[PDB]
Amino acid sequence: QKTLEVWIMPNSPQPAEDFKALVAPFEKAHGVEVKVTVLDWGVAWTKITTAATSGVGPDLTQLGTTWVGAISAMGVLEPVDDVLEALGGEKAYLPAVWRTTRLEGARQATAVPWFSELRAFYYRTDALKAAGVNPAEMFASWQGFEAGLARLKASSFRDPETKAPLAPLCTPGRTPRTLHNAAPWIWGAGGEIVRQAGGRWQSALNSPESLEGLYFFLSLAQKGYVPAESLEKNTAQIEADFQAGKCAVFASGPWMIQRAQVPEAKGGFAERTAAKNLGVAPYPAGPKGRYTFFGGSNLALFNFSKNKPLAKELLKYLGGPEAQVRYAQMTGMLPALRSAWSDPSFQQNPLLRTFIQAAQFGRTYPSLAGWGGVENLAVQHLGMAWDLVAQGRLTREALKDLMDKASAAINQALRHH
Amino acid sequence: MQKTLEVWIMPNSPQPAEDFKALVAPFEKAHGVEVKVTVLDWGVAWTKITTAATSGVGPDLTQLGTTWVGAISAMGVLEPVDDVLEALGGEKAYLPAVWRTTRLEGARQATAVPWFSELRAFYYRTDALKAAGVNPAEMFASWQGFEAGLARLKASSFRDPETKAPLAPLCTPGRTPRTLHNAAPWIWGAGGEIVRQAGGRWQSALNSPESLEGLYFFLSLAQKGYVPAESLEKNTAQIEADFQAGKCAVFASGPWMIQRAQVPEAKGGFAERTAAKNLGVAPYPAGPKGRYTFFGGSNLALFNFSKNKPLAKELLKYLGGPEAQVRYAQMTGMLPALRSAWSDPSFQQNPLLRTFIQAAQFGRTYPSLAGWGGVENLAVQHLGMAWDLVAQGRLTREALKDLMDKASAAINQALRHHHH
Numbered sequence: 001q002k003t004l005e006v007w008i009m010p011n012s013p014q015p016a017e018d019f020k021a022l023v024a025p026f027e028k029a030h031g032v033e034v035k036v037t038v039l040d041w042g043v044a045w046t047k048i049t050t051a052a053t054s055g056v057g058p059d060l061t062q063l064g065t066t067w068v069g070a071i072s073a074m075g076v077l078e079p080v081d082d083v084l085e086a087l088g089g090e091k092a093y094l095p096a097v098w099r100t101t102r103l104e105g106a107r108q109a110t111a112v113p114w115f116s117e118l119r120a121f122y123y124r125t126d127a128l129k130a131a132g133v134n135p136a137e138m139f140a141s142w143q144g145f146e147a148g149l150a151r152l153k154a155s156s157f158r159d160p161e162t163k164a165p166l167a168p169l170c171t172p173g174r175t176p177r178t179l180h181n182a183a184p185w186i187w188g189a190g191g192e193i194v195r196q197a198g199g200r201w202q203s204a205l206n207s208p209e210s211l212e213g214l215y216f217f218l219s220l221a222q223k224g225y226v227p228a229e230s231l232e233k234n235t236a237q238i239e240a241d242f243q244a245g246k247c248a249v250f251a252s253g254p255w256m257i258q259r260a261q262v263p264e265a266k267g268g269f270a271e272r273t274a275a276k277n278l279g280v281a282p283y284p285a286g287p288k289g290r291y292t293f294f295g296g297s298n299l300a301l302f303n304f305s306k307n308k309p310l311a312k313e314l315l316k317y318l319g320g321p322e323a324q325v326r327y328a329q330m331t332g333m334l335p336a337l338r339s340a341w342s343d344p345s346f347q348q349n350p351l352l353r354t355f356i357q358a359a360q361f362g363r364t365y366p367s368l369a370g371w372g373g374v375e376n377l378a379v380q381h382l383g384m385a386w387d388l389v390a391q392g393r394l395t396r397e398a399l400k401d402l403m404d405k406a407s408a409a410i411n412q413a414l415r416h417h
Numbered sequence: 418m419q420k421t422l423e424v425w426i427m428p429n430s431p432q433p434a435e436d437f438k439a440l441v442a443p444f445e446k447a448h449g450v451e452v453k454v455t456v457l458d459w460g461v462a463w464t465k466i467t468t469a470a471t472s473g474v475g476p477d478l479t480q481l482g483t484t485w486v487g488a489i490s491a492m493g494v495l496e497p498v499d500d501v502l503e504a505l506g507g508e509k510a511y512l513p514a515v516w517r518t519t520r521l522e523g524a525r526q527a528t529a530v531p532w533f534s535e536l537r538a539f540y541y542r543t544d545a546l547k548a549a550g551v552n553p554a555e556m557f558a559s560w561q562g563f564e565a566g567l568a569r570l571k572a573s574s575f576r577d578p579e580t581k582a583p584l585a586p587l588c589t590p591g592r593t594p595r596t597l598h599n600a601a602p603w604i605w606g607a608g609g610e611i612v613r614q615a616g617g618r619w620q621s622a623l624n625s626p627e628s629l630e631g632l633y634f635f636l637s638l639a640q641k642g643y644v645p646a647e648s649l650e651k652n653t654a655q656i657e658a659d660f661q662a663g664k665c666a667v668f669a670s671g672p673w674m675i676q677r678a679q680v681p682e683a684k685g686g687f688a689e690r691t692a693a694k695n696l697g698v699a700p701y702p703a704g705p706k707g708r709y710t711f712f713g714g715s716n717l718a719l720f721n722f723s724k725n726k727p728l729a730k731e732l733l734k735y736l737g738g739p740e741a742q743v744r745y746a747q748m749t750g751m752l753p754a755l756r757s758a759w760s761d762p763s764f765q766q767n768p769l770l771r772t773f774i775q776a777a778q779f780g781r782t783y784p785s786l787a788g789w790g791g792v793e794n795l796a797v798q799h800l801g802m803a804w805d806l807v808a809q810g811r812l813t814r815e816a817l818k819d820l821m822d823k824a825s826a827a828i829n830q831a832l833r834h835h836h837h
């Protein structure tokens with residue numbers, strides 16, 4: 001009896017059950033049993049690299065977008081250009097999403113886009129009205145963003161449930177995901193994490209442009225726009241603070257729209273003032289433009305698979321509009337296939353339509369074999385910058401010295417490929 | 418039993434399936450066939466069609482946007498239609514820009530039959546231009562006359578009789594998925610191109626001097642106060658609504674606005690509004706190196722897995738031919754793709770539609786590249802960043818050049834790697 005083995009991460013509330021519901025029509029159509037194994041993200045990395053070196057593993061694995069370069073460069077993934085042609089090729093994806101289909105600069109695709117993580121700003125419509133801040137102006141530009149946070153700091157408005165003021169902005173500082181939160185500020189200033197110029201990749205974290213963007217963002221906590229407790233918190237803790245009426249503004253993904261529709265007893269926040277006064281806007285334009293951070297996850301086929309033709313049919317199914325919409329629903333993500341965004345499921349909620357507006361500006365990291373190493377060094381040095389911010393000690397000079405250290409370590413890492 | 422044909426279409430007319438089934442009923446009766454129609458939203462149609470192409474399961478005929486013909490043709494899944502095109506009158510029966518959309522660039526054989534044409538020209542408020550002392554023949558003759566006319570429209574005290582407020586001189590979308598089509602005439606009129614052969618291969622020409630000249634000419638008009646910054650955050654339909662509502666002296670659109678001006682608001686038109694009662698149209702002005710009208714539209718293609726290519730070719734001959742051409746241009750608000758249909762009294766009796774036919778004479782399309790979807794995606798991404806600077810008054814020639822240099826690097830990578 002035909003079987004496929006698929007490894008996935010915990011993408012949805014009941015990961016195995018949801019994936020089995022997702023693929024049931026495919027199973028029934030081709031008389032195949034898809035065997036799913038759920039792996040936490042760090043357990044997944046170990047298992048996948050072990051499969052790559054040993055030549056023993058599943059047919060398909062989920063990959064984070066930032067893992068495609070490293071696993072591709074091992075020479076263990078089957079080309080999937082034919083799958084991607086079936087789904088509509090380069091045209092059917094945002095350019096930032098298309099970049100994650102391959103090792104940077106490779107002719108052959110080795111991963112199929114599955115779902116997209118992207119971030120935009122949620123805001124309390126009641127808080128901004130009370131502060132005399134127009135959201136269209138506040139999220140248009142860095143100048144409007146800083147000016148609106150100042151007006152939010154001054155506002156006498158109190159949440160009608162907490163009976164207390166709102167922090168103007170809640171954001172995590174030091175966290176493993178700190179580079180994703182920084183990236184739109186680096187990019188909007190004209191900077192980069194690493195850039196390809198002069199026949200090689202180099203750190204750009206200590207460029208003038210990158211330092212301007214980083215200092216703009218990190219300095220907002222020192223100006224009193226971000227409360228001290230936000231900088232002691234992880235991504236989920238900040239989401240809870242926004243739901244609980246403690247934040248006027250915070251960056252998250254499309255999952256918060258679904259949560260605002262669901263009672264707290266089902267893991268949502270529909271009863272709370274925030275859910276009833278919810279707006280969303282893209283990140284603001286910097287001096288060199290407007291960018292939305294993209295991540296998410298792709299699917300890859302190991303080239304030692306004994307089931308490649310059937311595995312490619314399953315990749316076409318998972319990558320295709322029906323499954324794209326269903327899984328984006330299950331995960332609270334955006335479909336990776338842009339064709340799926342035309343689905344009435346998206347077109348019928350004005351807040352989700354705003355995420356699709358945000359998506360036009362999408363930007364990803366380069367798909368480098370050495371990406372994990374680059375990101376680790378950038379996270380370590382930005383975490384030291386955020387530690388200075390939590391003490392009110394960050395200067396442009398202190399930030400420059402931390403990014404000069406990151407750039408030296410990164411350039412030595414990039415030397416190794 | 419009736420023979421069967423299946424056709425996939427997009428939502429081209431007010432009642433897409435019903436209008437198409439009306440259009441083909443005479444063919445059905447002539448050939449003892451039932452034509453099954455399936456309507457696909459424009460945003461899902463491409464993936465459904467490439468899924469059909471690769472699986473070998475689908476309709477007999479599909480609609481294709483003109484800009485899709487190269488990509489689907491290169492997949493090797495379409496049946497040659499040179500025979501059908503010769504039956505309809507051959508190369509001389511079509512405008513050259515329309516003929517170019519019948520095949521993959523450089524291909525030995527035609528794979529698509531022209532169905533209908535999208536083209537754009539400038540609508541203008543005849544009352545606004547009179548009040549501003551602008552002669553439409555001068556304003557729409559040259560880029561210098563166009564900018565001089567907008568300056569007089571900005572200075573004018575004229576108020577719309579209904580809004581009781583001044584009109585913006587020009588309304589245009591900025592960032593929109595269709596932003597390349599609005600830019601194209603300005604790139605072309607300067608002697609520029611989006612992609613052209615250079616050193617024997619297709620490469621970006623968006624960072625060429627001529628392209629940058631034409632783009633800066635057009636994009637800079639917003640910074641001079643001729644376009645409202647909120648226009649640059651609006652889609653194509655919202656801008657048509659602003660013109661109907663008396664907010665805009667001048668805006669580019671297709672021939673569908675002429676029929677809308679005739680019909681009451683209750684029927685989806687704007688006959689009650691000042692704009693409907695003071696409506697002029699002119700072709701795009703000539704640039705330094707020429708006058709060009711953007712052409713798009715849709716063609717019909719025959720999949721090589723069709724079970725009845727001779728009967729499907731009879732349906733392509735019918736849809737491509739004079740009677741059907743006139744009827745479907747009526748239903749859709751578009752221009753017929755077949756040049757002989759432009760002589761129908763339904764065009765020739767209406768002076769506004771006669772001006773679209775004048776505009777049509779300058780028609781120009783993108784090259785029919787296999788990689789076009791990639792090119793357009795990347796060109797839209799980077800023109801979006803340029804229009805975002807315009808909305809802030811921050812577009813310099815240097816900033817524009819840097820954005821087009823980035824666009825060109827990405828486009829050149831795409832063209833190099835395009836999968837066959």
Ligand SMILES: OC[C@H]1O[C@@H](O[C@@H]2[C@@H](O)[C@H](O)[C@@H](CO)O[C@H]2O)[C@H](O)[C@@H](O)[C@@H]1O
Binds near residue numbers: 041063066067294295
């Ligand atoms: O860095 C590895 C990959 O991480 C993914 O982010 C996931 C996130 O979506 C999920 O909510 C949590 C649960 O732990 O894990 C995060 O780290 C990104 O989407 C990928 O781009 C990235 O490759």
Ligand SMILES: OC[C@H]1O[C@@H](O[C@@H]2[C@@H](O)[C@H](O)[C@@H](CO)O[C@H]2O)[C@H](O)[C@@H](O)[C@@H]1O
Binds near residue numbers: 459713714715
């Ligand atoms: O990009 C694909 C094709 O788009 C057609 O334009 C249609 C337009 O006429 C219609 O108003 C809207 C509704 O969404 O869909 C547009 O994109 C063009 O005429 C083709 O040239 C192009 O290939």
